[PDB]
């Protein structure tokens, strides 16, 4: 069962935000990216978005987002995002997205409506971490198994929680309009609004679905009308004003927490050894940059660590006490000389 | 500024010090140790009884 997991985010709504770079410029968008985390080894990254996923206006793959206070929905396979190459969206749940695509320097996320394209790009570093000691850029078809950390594919109630807050007052210039001589305020049906003005003196009025006109005001730009909502909490976003008083009403769990799993890691080619009197030579040919670590079995190791990305030649000396080395991810190889 | 001081190992008594500066007024220090513990690092081997 998963509806009990989804129940937490039925209590919230999407929210408009500011994003520095839409397709035009400094902009207000529904897809503002708050933060990005890239700690998993296989390129799995977590995006914290301003929209909601998996909830209809319960459906599998959809994006639920906000338009000047009006909630709208789109199929999930329309939105895209990229850093340097086209990324791939896996799944979404609430304010979080799990993505799998290679390294880069900026995150761009975009989608296309019937005629208007929405997008923006944020410059937060995304890093690709190789496992083991064989640097690569795309995981291999075959190799061996290791234990690294990858981000879990499914949602569950973990010990990590976030905080919501009571929403603030949202100014909307659309509500206010000019009558013949007064200012007309038309709050939306089934919701309350707050009108504050200084056209004459200080004014404050809570209207509840009432079309009221105020005297002494001629132009409309003098003053403002807001929107009030009690339910449908919002995340502790830094891009919003806060409400009045203690701003705390619970917390929600964060899915897609990291976990331990089995990892495919490449295997380097076998180095060809040639032996001589108290010495060894390693004919060597790497497919990718790889680490040599070499040690002696005496009181002092003379440990040597080296990164090689080209064919090369190395001649090592070995004594009776012993020599040991690791190339790539092979088990360590120990050689022990003999009198001759 | 570094200042070294010596403390007798005995609780129940006060101890006064003055930190002297050539160009500034002396600074007082008052110290009273209340309780000192000498805890040993002990391991468990076995237990016996009737």
């Amino acid at each position, epitope marked *: 069962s998963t509806e009990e997991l989804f129940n937490e985010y039925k209590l919230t709504r999407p929210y408009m935000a500011r994003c520095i770079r839409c397709a035009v410029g400094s902009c207000h968008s529904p897809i503002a990216i708050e933060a990005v985390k890239s700690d998993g080894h296989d390129g799995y990254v977590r995006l914290q978005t301003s929209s909601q996923y998996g909830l209809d206006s319960l459906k599998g793959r959809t994006m639920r987002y906000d338009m000047h206070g009006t909630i709208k929905e789109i199929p999930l396979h329309q939105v895209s995002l990229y850093t340097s190459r086209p990324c791939h969206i896996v799944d979404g749940h609430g304010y979080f997205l799990l993505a799998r695509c290679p390294a880069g320097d900026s995150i761009t996320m975009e989608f296309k409506k019937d005629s208007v394209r929405h997008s923006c790009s944020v410059p937060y570093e995304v890093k690709f971490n190789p496992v083991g000691r064989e640097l690569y850029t795309h995981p291999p078809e075959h190799g061996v198994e290791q234990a690294c950390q990858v981000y879990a594919h499914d949602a569950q109630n973990r010990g990590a929680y976030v905080e919501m807050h009571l929403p603030g007052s949202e100014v909307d210039s659309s509500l206010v309009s000019l009558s013949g001589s007064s200012v007309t305020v038309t709050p939306p049906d089934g919701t309350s609004a707050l009108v504050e003005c200084e056209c004459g003196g200080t004014k404050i009025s809570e209207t509840i679905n009432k079309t009221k006109q105020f005297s002494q005001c001629t132009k409309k730009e003098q003053c403002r009308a807001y929107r009030l909502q009690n339910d449908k909490w919002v995340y502790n976003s830094d891009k919003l004003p806060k409400a009045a008083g203690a701003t705390l009403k619970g917390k929600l769990h964060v899915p897609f*927490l990291l976990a*331990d*799993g089995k990892c495919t890691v490449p295997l380097a080619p076998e180095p060809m050894i040639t032996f001589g009197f108290r010495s060894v030579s390693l004919k060597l040919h790497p497919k990718n940059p790889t680490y040599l670590i070499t040690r002696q079995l005496a009181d002092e190791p003379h440990y040597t660590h080296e990164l090689i990305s080209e064919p090369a030649v190395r001649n090592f000396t070995v004594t009776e006490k012993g020599w040991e080395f690791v190339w790539g991810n092979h088990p360590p190889k120990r050689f022990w000389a003999q009198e001759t | 500024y570094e200042h070294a001081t010596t403390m007798p190992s005995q609780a129940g008594i006060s101890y006064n010090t003055i930190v002297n500066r050539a160009g500034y007024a002396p600074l007082p220090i008052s110290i009273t140790p209340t309780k000192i513990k000498l805890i040993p690092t002990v*391991n*468990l081997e076995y237990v016996t009884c009737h």
Partner: nanobody
Amino acid sequence: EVQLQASGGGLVQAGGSLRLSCAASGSIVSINVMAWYRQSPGKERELVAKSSGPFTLYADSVKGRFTISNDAAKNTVDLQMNSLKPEDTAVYYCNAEGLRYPSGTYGPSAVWGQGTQVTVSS
């Protein structure tokens, strides 16, 4: 010297629900890592569960069928099992790592209990 005592388990039919309990006793005050490990015959040891304070972890083949709860006050970890499969036949061990002795002579880091055998019949 801290020791871990395991209890629970036993014989059951396919689809049953059991409980495993591991308790820590000795010169300990606070514990960090509660974990469970399973070892089937002819195979190496593997992790099944991992609990540490509020966080809990699960392996790939065991999601949605095992639940882990830790009580730091009693320093016990309880593993609730539901809807068991014939692949679950193995001996289960409980692990404790990151032990904080209350001075509390510093000693071995990790400890191990005897474990319990769990067998489900098809």
